[PDB]
């Protein structure tokens, strides 16, 4: 009778995430930023501010930071925007695992929307 989360669809609507990180790193990696292809989270550091928020995951597209639209950002300017966003960082994110999966070898999306790497 357990109720497993792993079969519930991951929400695909945009979300607001507010991370308070003072003057430390946010604790995640981004990929993308080839010509408007999107900026995606590829890795969240265990114990970092992004992990502690509990509200971001690999495969999230970063739509904006502090009101600055990053949908069509280059990866380096995205990184600059994130690193210079200040102590309070307001991210709009949207889970886009299909688009993310193009970047990571042998990765695909299962029926709940989770990214699987074989």
């Amino acid at each position: 009778s357990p109720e497993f989360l792993g079969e519930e669809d991951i929400p695909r609507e945009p979300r607001r995430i507010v991370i308070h990180r003072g003057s430390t790193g946010l604790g995640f990696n981004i990929v993308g930023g080839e010509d408007g292809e999107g900026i995606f989270i590829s890795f969240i550091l265990a114990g970092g501010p992004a992990d502690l928020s509990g509200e971001l995951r690999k495969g999230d597209q970063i739509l904006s930071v502090n009101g600055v639209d990053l949908r069509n950002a280059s990866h380096e300017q995205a990184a600059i925007a994130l690193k210079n966003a200040g102590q309070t960082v307001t991210i709009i994110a949207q889970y886009k695992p299909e688009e993310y999966s193009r970047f990571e070898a042998n990765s695909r999306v299962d029926s709940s929307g989770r990214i699987v790497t074989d």
Partner: peptide
């Protein structure tokens, strides 16, 4: 692909 990856 112009691929790059940054830590933030």
């Amino acid at each position: 692909k112009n691929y790059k990856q940054f830590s933030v």
